[PDB]
Amino acid sequence: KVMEYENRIRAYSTPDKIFRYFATLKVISEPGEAEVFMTPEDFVRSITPNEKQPEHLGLDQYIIKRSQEREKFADEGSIFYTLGECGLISFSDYIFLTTVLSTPQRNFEIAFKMFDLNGDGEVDMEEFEQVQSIIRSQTSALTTYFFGADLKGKLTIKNFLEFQRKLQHDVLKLEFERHDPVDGRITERQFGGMLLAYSGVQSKKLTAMQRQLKKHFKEGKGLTFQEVENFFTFLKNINDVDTALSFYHMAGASLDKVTMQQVARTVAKVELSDHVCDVVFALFDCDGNGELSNKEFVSIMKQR
Amino acid sequence: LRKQRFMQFSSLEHEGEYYMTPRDFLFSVMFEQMERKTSVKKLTKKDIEDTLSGIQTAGCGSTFFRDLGDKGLISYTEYLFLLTILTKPHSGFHVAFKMLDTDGNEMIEKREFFKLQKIISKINTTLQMRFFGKRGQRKLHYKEFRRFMENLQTEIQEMEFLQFSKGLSFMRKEDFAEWLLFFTNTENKDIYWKNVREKLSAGESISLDEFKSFCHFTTHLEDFAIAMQMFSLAHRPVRLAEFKRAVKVATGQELSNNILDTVFKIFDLDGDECLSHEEFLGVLKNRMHR
Ligand SMILES: [Ca+2]
Numbered sequence: 001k002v003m004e005y006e007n008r009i010r011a012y013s014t015p016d017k018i019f020r021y022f023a024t025l026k027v028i029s030e031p032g033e034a035e036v037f038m039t040p041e042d043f044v045r046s047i048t049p050n051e052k053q054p055e056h057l058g059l060d061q062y063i064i065k066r067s068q069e070r071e072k073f074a075d076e077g078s079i080f081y082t083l084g085e086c087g088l089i090s091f092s093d094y095i096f097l098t099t100v101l102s103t104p105q106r107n108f109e110i111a112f113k114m115f116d117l118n119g120d121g122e123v124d125m126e127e128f129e130q131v132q133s134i135i136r137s138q139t140s141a142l143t144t145y146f147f148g149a150d151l152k153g154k155l156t157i158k159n160f161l162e163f164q165r166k167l168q169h170d171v172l173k174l175e176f177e178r179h180d181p182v183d184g185r186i187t188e189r190q191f192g193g194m195l196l197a198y199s200g201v202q203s204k205k206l207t208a209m210q211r212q213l214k215k216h217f218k219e220g221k222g223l224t225f226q227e228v229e230n231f232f233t234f235l236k237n238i239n240d241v242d243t244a245l246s247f248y249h250m251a252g253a254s255l256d257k258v259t260m261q262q263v264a265r266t267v268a269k270v271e272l273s274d275h276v277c278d279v280v281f282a283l284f285d286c287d288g289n290g291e292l293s294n295k296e297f298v299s300i301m302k303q304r
Numbered sequence: 305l306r307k308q309r310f311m312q313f314s315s316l317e318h319e320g321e322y323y324m325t326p327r328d329f330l331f332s333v334m335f336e337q338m339e340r341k342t343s344v345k346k347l348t349k350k351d352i353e354d355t356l357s358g359i360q361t362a363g364c365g366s367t368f369f370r371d372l373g374d375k376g377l378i379s380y381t382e383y384l385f386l387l388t389i390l391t392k393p394h395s396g397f398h399v400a401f402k403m404l405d406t407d408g409n410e411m412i413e414k415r416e417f418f419k420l421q422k423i424i425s426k427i428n429t430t431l432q433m434r435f436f437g438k439r440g441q442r443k444l445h446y447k448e449f450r451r452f453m454e455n456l457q458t459e460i461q462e463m464e465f466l467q468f469s470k471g472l473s474f475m476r477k478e479d480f481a482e483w484l485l486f487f488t489n490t491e492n493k494d495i496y497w498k499n500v501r502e503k504l505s506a507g508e509s510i511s512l513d514e515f516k517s518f519c520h521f522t523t524h525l526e527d528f529a530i531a532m533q534m535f536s537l538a539h540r541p542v543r544l545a546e547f548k549r550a551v552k553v554a555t556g557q558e559l560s561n562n563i564l565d566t567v568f569k570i571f572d573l574d575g576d577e578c579l580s581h582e583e584f585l586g587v588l589k590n591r592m593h594r
């Protein structure tokens with residue numbers, strides 16, 4: 001019951017409330033007023049349905065924390081250390097990171113080139129805030145990281161997209177690890193939950209499909225991180241995939257497994273294993289006809 | 305269903321299947337209707353060989369379909385394939401090639417091209433001859449695939465250019481407006497046409513090259529619409545400088561002043577020199593879907 005309420009917060013509350021529900025730390029350094037922070041685990045939890053918040057760390061309840069080294073909260077090399085020395089995520093960074101996670105690469109490319117000085121895809125700090133603001137409506141350590149110690153430098157699209165890919169990778173890796181993989185593999189059902197969560201769909205029927213996934217793969221070899229990451233790289237490319245499928249749309253044809261692999265390798269530049277595609281079809285082929293209509297998969301992912 | 309429209313323009317029939325000649329195909333792309341009903345000639349397997357032998361003499365460039373005229377055959381599958389190509393930016397050609405080259409040997413073979421027909425189903429034709437020879441002897445490499453698709457787009461633009469210029473060397477601004485609005489039958493069309501008649505100066509007429517540049521820009525509408533939406537979200541009116549930078553970002557290139565001026569005279573609907581860009585985009589989408 002708790003998990004369902006939490007899922008409504010994720011799907012319908014404001015970012016303010018989501019952050020106050022899932023963030024677990026309130027750090028004080030008096031006279032400095034306290035500030036609430038997510039750990040990377042909290043951030044991943046806030047975007048992962050059916051993951052319970054620690055029972056005494058619900059709404060507005062936090063774990064209290066007061067030259068000297070400060071406690072750190074992210075693994076070696078994590079993207080979250082771009083935000084500061086501890087890997088903690090303030091509210092404003094939470095807004096920014098969720099925008100970066102979900103924005104198509106092309107929209108950032110266009111935005112950088114439309115709002116900068118010369119159209120090269122190189123913004124300064126005020127232009128980058130225009131881009132963020134616009135990208136948001138469409139749907140300090142880091143400002144120094146992007147624009148230099150003096151805040152006078154500019155941010156190229158090439159560097160910012162490396163940031164975006166690193167961020168997407170580290171978050172997907174952390175989500176993968178939070179399903180506690182056995183020998184580097186998570187279960188078909190766990191992968192299925194990641195696909196539903198990503199789609200943002202609120203459907204009892206799709207939820208029924210996902211829990212059924214255990215029965216379908218009695219076999220149970222699970223999915224490696226490379227299999228999962230390749231499919232999410234395919235999803236990130238869904239608009240260009242859909243365009244590449246133009247002939248199939250004209251024919252009224254649905255998407256079968258061999259076509260999904262061909263367009264994935266052609267457009268997203270990844271190989272999708274037979275097993276990952278079987279899991280995807282078993283999840284979203286609701287009418288059970290063995291192929292995916294535009295309504296059953298592509299449209300869901302595009303309109304997410 | 306584009307199948308009704310295919311059979312309406314098809315002038316050929318064989319064993320229950322309808323076929324276009326290259327002439328038929330060109331007309332179905334430029335026009336919504338016939339203007340005259342087309343007579344359907346039944347083909348034996350002997351009419352077909354006769355109609356296919358001779359692809360020797362047509363031009364391997366941008367006059368391939370116009371040179372063939374009625375001397376060829378195009379199946380429903382191939383009609384849909386050619387239509388998808390006409391909408392693609394140049395960057396989509398290699399994607400289309402690689403989608404068909406399923407064994408990855410960088411050549412399309414007749415057997416791989418036949419996958420399109422199998423999609424439609426779930427005999428010899430002009431394209432199969434041009435690409436693979438009569439027994440599928442030949443294999444199609446990317447550079448002759450790319451050149452054929454570039455030349456297909458070029459051929460439609462050259463044919464439409466002369467169709468709407470009525471044979472003159474240059475397109476008048478209102479001839480370009482007639483082309484642009486040819487597939488537009490929406491509730492605001494009287495306002496567009498009033499602007500054409502009253503605000504289109506007899507200024508600098510449009511060259512074929514300037515027309516071709518606009519047609520290439522219409523294949524980058526996805527990025528152009530994203531740029532238009534970002535200006536709208538920024539509450540920035542789309543004046544000529546905004547339009548120019550969205551064109552350059554979507555495109556890499558410029559449009560000529562006579563064409564920019566024509567677009568703004570037609571779609572500046574408020575009189576403040578801002579473009580009604582949603583209505584413009586609508587007409588552009590009318591064009592692309594033909
Ligand atoms: Ca289905």
Ligand SMILES: [Ca+2]
Pocket residue numbers: 404405406407408409410411412413416
């Ligand atoms: Ca091949």
